[PDB]
Amino acid sequence: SARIGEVKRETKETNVSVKINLDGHGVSDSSTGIPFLDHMLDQLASHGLFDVHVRATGDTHIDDHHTNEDVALAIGTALLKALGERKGINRFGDFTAPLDEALIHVSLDLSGRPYLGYNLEIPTQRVGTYDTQLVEHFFQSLVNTSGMTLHIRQLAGKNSHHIIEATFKAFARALRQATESDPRRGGTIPSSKG
Amino acid sequence: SARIGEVKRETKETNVSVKINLDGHGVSDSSTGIPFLDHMLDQLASHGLFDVHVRATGDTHIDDHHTNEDVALAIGTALLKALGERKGINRFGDFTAPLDEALIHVSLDLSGRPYLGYNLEIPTQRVGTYDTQLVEHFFQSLVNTSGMTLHIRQLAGKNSHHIIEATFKAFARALRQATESDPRRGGTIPSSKG
Amino acid sequence: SARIGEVKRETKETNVSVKINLDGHGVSDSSTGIPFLDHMLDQLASHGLFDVHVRATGDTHIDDHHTNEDVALAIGTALLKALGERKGINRFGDFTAPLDEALIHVSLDLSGRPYLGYNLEIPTQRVGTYDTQLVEHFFQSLVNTSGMTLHIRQLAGKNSHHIIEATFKAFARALRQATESDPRRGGTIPSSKG
Amino acid sequence: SARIGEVKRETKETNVSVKINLDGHGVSDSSTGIPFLDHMLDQLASHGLFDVHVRATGDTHIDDHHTNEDVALAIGTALLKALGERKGINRFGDFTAPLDEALIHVSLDLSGRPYLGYNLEIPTQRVGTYDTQLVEHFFQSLVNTSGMTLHIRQLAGKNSHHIIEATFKAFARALRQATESDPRRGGTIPSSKG
Amino acid sequence: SARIGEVKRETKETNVSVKINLDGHGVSDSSTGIPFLDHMLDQLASHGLFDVHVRATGDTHIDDHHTNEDVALAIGTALLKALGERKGINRFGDFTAPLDEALIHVSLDLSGRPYLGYNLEIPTQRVGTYDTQLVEHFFQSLVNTSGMTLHIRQLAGKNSHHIIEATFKAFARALRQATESDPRRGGTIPSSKG
Amino acid sequence: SARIGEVKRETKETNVSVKINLDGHGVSDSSTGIPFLDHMLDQLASHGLFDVHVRATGDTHIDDHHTNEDVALAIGTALLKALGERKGINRFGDFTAPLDEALIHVSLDLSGRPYLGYNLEIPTQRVGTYDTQLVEHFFQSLVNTSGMTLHIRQLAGKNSHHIIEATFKAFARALRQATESDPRRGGTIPSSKG
Ligand SMILES: O=P(O)(O)C[C@@H](O)Cn1cncn1
Ligand SMILES: O=P(O)(O)C[C@@H](O)Cn1cncn1
Ligand SMILES: O=P(O)(O)C[C@@H](O)Cn1cncn1
Ligand SMILES: O=P(O)(O)C[C@@H](O)Cn1cncn1
Ligand SMILES: O=P(O)(O)C[C@@H](O)Cn1cncn1
Ligand SMILES: O=P(O)(O)C[C@@H](O)Cn1cncn1
Ligand SMILES: [Cl-]
Ligand SMILES: [Cl-]
Ligand SMILES: [Mn+2]
Ligand SMILES: [Mn+2]
Ligand SMILES: [Mn+2]
Ligand SMILES: [Mn+2]
Ligand SMILES: [Mn+2]
Ligand SMILES: [Mn+2]
Ligand SMILES: [Mn+2]
Ligand SMILES: [Mn+2]
Ligand SMILES: [Mn+2]
Ligand SMILES: [Mn+2]
Ligand SMILES: [Mn+2]
Ligand SMILES: [Mn+2]
């Protein structure tokens, strides 16, 4: 059956609901209260073929920060839940995607060990109304609850929207690869330490 | 039938036996007299899905060097034997794998022309009892007898075990890709110069 | 009895009311017209255990500046009033608090001599709608009316919200320490010059 | 009652058992297969007043790495279990400890968000038989499973044993502080977002 | 009973008597023949809550040096005597104190091993009639006879009196902390090597 | 009569016994559990003409560190005991000794004030199994308990064994000089401050 993870979490800052299907058809259904983040989550669905359902509300009058963080945390947990014991999966993903002049490499390992390597240099402070510092925080928080090893490398880029969107496209494709079935490994856990 | 290469070689320094199945199921069976190298050869099996059988003894009281070298030479020859005329294969492999903070890119071409490009900077001299200079030598010797074009690029890393292990994981996945069947090329040799 | 200081002040720019209990239970009740500042004043209450009541209105259509300043001035005066002759208190506070990658050291002396040492480098201009230059001004104004010696040192940090919030947490804990009873000094003024 | 966390975990690499009492009397009972790490865990007990019980076996013929990592992971989980919802605790710890010429600052926040800031520069590769790269890895792994924000800063030091031991002493004292009861906060969760 | 240490020493250069109560009430009673040093010893009493009795005479027509040194040596011995086997004490102290623009960190360990780390840069040669080189010598000599590990770090400062006085305040508070009872350790020696 | 100092000390880390004759005939009798240190202590005897008896056991499975330190501490105390009031001695020693390309200057003053000046740069981490950081620690600890002013200056050298051994030879000769009778001073204490 399809691998589906669901998470609901609320604090005094935010209220978040996430549902992700690893074996999806790219159904895009994200409403975070942060329009730019919604557009990015749509790439995750369109290019990763995940079904992505997100609802969030929160204290955006203070900052988009808490909302952004809590969405990311919940997505990471949903990924973790959907994955289980990771039997039969590729485990590793590696993809470099452009968007015009931008070029972003993502490599990830569904390892159970959280790590973010990140070197983006986004040259403007706001893309629309979205604080561009929140991109790093989105990935960091997602890593922390998913237990993913994730490296994001900026190889080229100038336009902030292009840089960020190329990142989400590359991430989506790398994550799709990692989560997909390995046709040769016959349902074994992809690790020497099992 | 499965592509299997077997090599036995002895000198006054070492005695080595290798058997590799390119079309394996990740059977790990390596005993070199060098425990760290055994752990690395296990990644080769687990992530490359090669069946890897290695037995070696040698003059480890002098150095792990001769053993390490002769194991690598024999593995390269076994790969060469298993491959044959390389009909119908992908030929090229390209994969970047992390292990936590380490990130290693491997690109290879089963070209018949030996070349190693290598830029690892391993910041400690011994990982366990294993001399970290021997990593480069392992790949160089393997290249020399297999007739492989191999590039290994350190993109990130600090922990020596992480750097080396990520290298073996990336190599395993790139080699798996290169050795696998190309579903479109209908048993032709993947070269313009045939 | 509990040490409570109350201040009301109005100008043509702003209208401010503050009530602070040094011996509080962390009651958070701040409405400044500046949502980010409200969130920071909540840390002051939650981590310092002060009861913090603030109401402010003002010329935010011009700038948050005058409001921010006048709130800070009034808080400083309220602290001064609540403290009195400082009999029996610790006087000095010293605490370093993180928020994720940010790490902020605050040291203060309830000396009667105003001084601010401040080296924060906040890498974005707006956190939500809040002008990040106003952080320094908040502490400067508070120091000026409280007669506090205050040092704020950025030891690490990248995310602007993390940097600022860690500052308020560290400040809250240092101020709590300084204002609390010294169990050994038997109600004496903590100074050699009395 | 005393806050006690217990963890047993085994892999093909290691076998680990940990029991930690947050409200201990400094009972030191650590046997990891890594003598230097045992000595460090004794400081954790002696200076933190934790009761620390650790048993580990593993593939030390390969490297101390896997053992070191798996001990740290299990300690982090044990801390997490012992802490619960963190009601009534100080939450934050801050301590700088010397050992002769070495001087190490540790600041931590029991936040639920893993982060390690670390800048130690240990000038030798082996302290006894212990690979000094493994110090960073111990703290990283502990952070990852405990969900702790941890900063370790080398302020002075030359002797590798002094640097590492001062780190464990400072960490022990900061962790003791963070885990202890806050006498004023009346069993409330020490956070504004509850 | 109160922990009191007394020392009398005379040479052809100086004549010194010291009495220190670790469990004091901040009784200040210092007359060294060096007025600035008397003022500093008063901070030690006022902020450390030590009872400090010092009488010294000596060859101040030559230099304040011998007097300064012999006072410090005798204070260190008095501390050592008052401390004994150090049963049940905190052992470690850590405090950073300002005086206006000056900010001085002191960390110390009552270890039995003398060490001074010191980086003050006092920008004038005489504060009143007191040679500012003698500050370092005071702490060095005190360390040498007390068997204390002591680190003094200048974090900020310009005015020489402020720098020196902040040092004595920070030292007093760190020493108070280190010498005080640890409420949890039940009269045990605070060391793993007992 | 011959000036003989004897010290026995034990901790949970080590057990040490030392006997030194200042007026010896170079009797070498050192067994520390650290073979390289034994060889160095033999130079002390052979070139200083001290009779040197040392027995030590300790936690060398952790590190040679604690043993090395505790031997040095005990030697320093033994020197102090053997010396007494230092009547009639040279007090000062000054010698520069080579060992092949290495050249080491030692100057010392039996002053009653501990100080180590040390600038050795030993270019390898292990001489045999001996951690070369422990050389500095040996001299520091010896100074701390003997109350000696000691300067060690590397004037030339490349081979680590040569550097360290030349240091012990120079030290032995300087210490011999300092401890020997001054034929002119007629049993007076060699100080202006008696
Ligand atoms: O968990 P896996 O499958 O990546 C295998 C481990 O040996 C990895 N590793 C992590 N640190 C040192 N080695
Ligand atoms: O052998 P192949 O299939 O890579 C084809 C050759 O033309 C490659 N080549 C090597 N040197 C110059 N060209
Ligand atoms: O006011 P206090 O208690 O800090 C004591 C003063 O001597 C401080 N001081 C200020 N400038 C020079 N000394
Ligand atoms: O979780 P807590 O108690 O530290 C309160 C949060 O507002 C912290 N925070 C984290 N990112 C931005 N703010
Ligand atoms: O004496 P303590 O209590 O600090 C414990 C010792 O292990 C310290 N140490 C000193 N050098 C190497 N380790
Ligand atoms: O003890 P002695 O014999 O070296 C004589 C002293 O005057 C030395 N001294 C130390 N500090 C300033 N002078
Ligand atoms: Cl690249
Ligand atoms: Cl600092
Ligand atoms: Mn955050
Ligand atoms: Mn777009
Ligand atoms: Mn070779
Ligand atoms: Mn491994
Ligand atoms: Mn203004
Ligand atoms: Mn916040
Ligand atoms: Mn690891
Ligand atoms: Mn130790
Ligand atoms: Mn002097
Ligand atoms: Mn003053
Ligand atoms: Mn030591
Ligand atoms: Mn020799």
Numbering used by the authors:
A (entry chain A), B (entry chain A), C (entry chain A), D (entry chain A), E (entry chain A), F (entry chain A): 9 to 202
From the paper:
The program of herbicide development described herein aims to identify inhibitors of imidazoleglycerolphosphate‐dehydratase (IGPD; EC 4.2.1.19), an enzyme of histidine biosynthesis in plants and microorganisms. Previous studies have shown that IGPD is inhibited by triazolylphosphonates, whose potency is based on mimicking key reaction intermediates. In this paper we describe work on the lead compound, 2‐hydroxy‐3‐(1,2,4‐triazol‐1‐yl) propylphosphonate (C348) and present a series of structures of IGPD, from Arabidopsis thaliana, complexed with a synthetic racemate of C348 and with the enantiopure compounds.
In this study, weak electron density was observed adjacent to the chiral center of the lead compound in a 1.85 Å resolution structure of our target enzyme in complex with a racemate. However, as with the electron density for C348 in the 1.85 Å structure, the density at 1.1 Å resolution was also weak around C3. Nevertheless, a small peak could be observed in the map around C3 when contoured at 1 σ, the position of which was consistent with the binding of the (S)‐C348. This finding indicated that in the crystal, the active sites of some of the enzyme molecules were occupied by (S)‐C348 and others were occupied by (R)‐C348. Subsequent refinement of this structure with occupancies of 0.6 and 0.4 for the (S)‐ and (R)‐C348, respectively, produced a model which fully explained the electron density, thus indicating that both enantiomers of C348 were bound to an essentially invariant enzyme structure. The two enantiomers thus trace an inverted path between the metal binding site and the phosphonate binding site, whereby they are related by mirror‐image packing. Both enantiomers retain low‐energy conformations with approximately staggered torsion angles, with the largest deviation in the atomic position of equivalent atoms occurring at C3 of the backbone, thus explaining the weak density at this position observed in the complexes of IGPD2 with the racemate.
